[model samples]
Target chain A: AFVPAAHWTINLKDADIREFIDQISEITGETFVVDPRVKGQVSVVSKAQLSLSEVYQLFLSVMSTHGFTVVAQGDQARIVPNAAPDRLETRVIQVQQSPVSELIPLIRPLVPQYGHLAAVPSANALIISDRSANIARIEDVIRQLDQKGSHDYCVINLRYGWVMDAAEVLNNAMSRGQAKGAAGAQVIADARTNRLIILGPPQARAKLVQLAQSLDTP
Target chain B: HWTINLKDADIREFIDQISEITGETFVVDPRVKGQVSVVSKAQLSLSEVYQLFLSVMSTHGFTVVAQGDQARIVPNRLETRVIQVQQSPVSELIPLIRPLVPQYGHLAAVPSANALIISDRSANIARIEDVIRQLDQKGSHDYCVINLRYGWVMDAAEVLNNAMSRGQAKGAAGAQVIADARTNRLIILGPPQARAKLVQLAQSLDTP
Candidate 1:
């Protein structure tokens, strides 16, 4: 089954004004929007502000006088070329903001009044490809649920869609289902059939079951 | 003869260059570490030490002293000096001789203030301004002489702003702003260029 992959977002803040910003824009050739409303607060975005490596380059040139030294650790860092020594060397200790999507796990538990409106049973089996996307979706659901009435439903975040190769996705799904007790959601063998199933109230469940019945035996 | 030790090689080279430039032959007594002593057949006067200093060591942070029959060269750590040219409202010759006496006196006042100003040309204007600022911050009861001749022609406010900017940039004390009429024999307490500028300014005032 084909599922929509997680998308990217980028945030820009007003306080990030520096001479290097022009140089960065020239190199990347991308226009950045500055929203004055988010002044002083870090603007979060889905896309890379500069590449993860570019930040290290700027960090070396801009903050070297302030006693910043680069250090390298881990396998991913070992492969980085020697030409970019700063990136190869990891910082001794650096304080930086993590991606906003990374906060999903912590936010999911805080969701309130999410089990009253719909009669759908709570899901025991769950799958997630990106931790950030899961958190964002859960937070969004929780926020909407709190404002509106509670709805009893569970999300089975299909992780298979994120992987590019079919064999890897199928192996992952099978292994993940075996590891857990329940048989994991299956991939659609046919292109014409929709793979999404929203197990919810009687009406929604009936519709999903009807769609599943129509699938041709492969 | 008195002995002086200099840790910096630049200062040692400076002394050697100054000695060469002055054409004053001194005994290269390698017996003492970083020691260069000269013996005179007759007792050397302060004026000769001053001449040697002005010719060679003045700009290079070397102080001269008369130790018995030998005039010794004492090297300085920092290239700085606090020169007090005696106030002589009558003697026009004082400015001419001012650099010479201190050049010798600095050797005597070792570690106090080495006379780096050999020819008034080495006195930096900014350094003199720094001394003035230090004096102002101290609020010393004793009256301090401030050279205003170079900065006087410009706008008074601009001069004050420049002084403040210089003080802030250099992280020095506040400056004491005084008019030339309030002081006598414009004394410059800075590098050679500053001293020379004050001297030129004073000479201009002395003319007509």
Candidate 2:
């Protein structure tokens, strides 16, 4: 069983950084390995109080301002310079809808220059080795982007315009590349039924249908 | 162009007739074979009939490639094209637009120009671009400025960045927060929803 830090109060102004760390350890029961250079005055005067997690975050924020950061090593938190060789961790994020190759550029900025990022194309997975905090943020980004849209497969029957003609119009407008094996909003013309088949997200299909019907004029 | 009705004609016959009518060379791969049945009520020009023939061929899972003097009909084979992603980072566009590419095709990022070099059946290329356009639309991303009335903008930004890095601010995952110490404002750029979450988080840090 795991227990989170209980809510606590803290009111310190221009307090010695060592005393601040001692207070954090006393309140949160966390251990630390402070670098010799990690010494400065700090302040986090919050009468309203914060949970143990937020308290820890506040500690991180204060440390960040002093050009230092905390990297957890086993049970101890290592406070070091911002550019120090950090305790790096690796995570493999499995992407469902988005391509792994595509996520690299977006996530690269979130990672420190010293971190590593690579794509596993066959499995659509991302292998990122970076600081634990950065890894957490990268995972969140992947979650936000990997969601599959509620797509609809619909058919638009034309009463006037030719199926091929209307299909071309919609395809050109939507940039479907006119490929049969396409994704996103796909418009396939069935000359026999004089119907145009559409496949895409609900919002997108609605717009496609609207355009298709407009083009289906007599 | 001549108009004719075929109930179930060999695809080769249509090819032969079109070859004679258009005075063009037709090279059908040995694997190319199908039966097409079409009834065109109106008379069409040589170009129209030729296009119609292509439309029918595609339905049968075949594609035509013009190799210098001749048109070669082959099984829908994967080909490659380059698409320059205008609105979004090429990386962000990948996961969203990749679903549009078939299994055989490949999509890779070109870092320099932020473009995607897609390898797939030619027909699918345009559709991928269309979806990419939708994903890369102008309004897909938004910006907001938070005027921190009280707290240190730099400190607040650091706190928010830490929260985001810790995955605490899930909605604002990849969103960036820039602190303008001179103006005491935080400038944010991300998806619309992402920006909203960051705005509230920044507000929390506004007070001492």
Candidate 3:
């Protein structure tokens, strides 16, 4: 069975803490457990055992339906809302029979078009995409966080093979025909930046990179 | 408890005579044509009717069917299904008014009865105000009555005509009187006199 879990640590105003928890509970059906050591900081967890890709899609869909924005965490594989002292974030991991490559396509399309092909910035933080071994590396980081139950720290300077494939595809498409047809293929690679971070395990990373490299050559 | 076969002439006559004696209103509902239905106005309490039926059946030596698919001899019979009359909070009125606010704009705050005063000139605004005021003074604090009477009209001509006539007859004083009636209430009065009259009649207590 797949379980989805998300964690966020933030210092909220005393007056807004209760309302924030209540709204989160209402939206996610998961109770906010107060982190006693970190006053004003709360952690909410939802145990939905599905692919991170599917869970991310569901989170985006729910937020959009209720007129909310989803904040991306680049290679770290977390998405959240861009509100200060009142932030909402979702992190998910799946113990799956297959690797993360199988899940990338599910979330790839949700990434916005016509921005920096590398990464998107949220309200207070910037999401940076690593062109080498991105997806598997992000998933590995999520798994470690899940094991340790750490909620607030940020990951840094990650490199992944999938990211290398993405760079190669952009290069090939740019060199072949920069306009019309080339632009269309370039958009696909750009959208895959966020999704490529959802692939899990070493094998999944290898598979996605291989797929990306195939697109680059063909 | 009495079963009157439609083919029985004496039974038919008895039913007709009872209708005439009690001034019971009978109508064939358009949804269920050919079915004769009577809404009785006779002010007989449930227990009183029960006792009266028992005594009449005993005196006439007629069979009273109790509980069964077929009729048989008995002194009296009573059939009832439990029903609950629930009182909800004033907040319950939100569901009724919420949709209308979006549909009618700022006009949604107009008390329904006041709306009636604005639309039905023939309506006794004073009488309506008296009833509502009495209800409020008695500390009958939480209740909502929706005036669905004028709710159907949408055009400007109909709304204006209705408001003018009601203002003319009831006067602004009477209109404001009913307006002060309650914390939760609705009054719908409007033009299309025949429809409004029908609505008023429906809201009225059935007479004996």
Candidates 1 onward: DockQ, in order: 0.00, 0.01, 0.00
Candidate 1: CAPRI quality band: incorrect
Clashes of each: 26, 12, 21
Among these predictions, the greatest DockQ belongs to 2
lDDT score for residue B103 of model 2: 58
lDDT of 2 at A22: 77
Error of 2 at A105 (Å): 24
Error of 3 at B119 (Å): 61
lDDT of each residue in B107-202, candidate 2, tens digit only? 666545566666556666776676566457443333444545578777887889899999888888866665655445565656545765776677
Worst 10 residues of 3 chain B by lDDT: B76-85
CAPRI grade of model 2? incorrect
Question: TM for chain B in all models?
Answer: 0.26, 0.37, 0.18
Q: Please list the residue runs of candidate 2 whose C-alpha ends up more than 4 Å from where it truly belongs after superposition.
A: A1-7, A84-218, B1-84, B88-133, B137-208
Question: What lDDT would each prediction earn against the true structure?
Answer: 0.30, 0.60, 0.28
Candidate 2, Cα interface RMSD: 25.3
What DockQ number belongs to candidate 2? 0.01
lDDT of 3 by residue, B33-138 (tens): 1112111222344333333333322332332332234222321111111111123222322232332222211111112112111111113322332333332321
Residue-wise lDDT of candidate 2 within A126-210, one digit each (tens)?
6565555677787887776456342223445566778888877778866745433333555656565566756455445545655
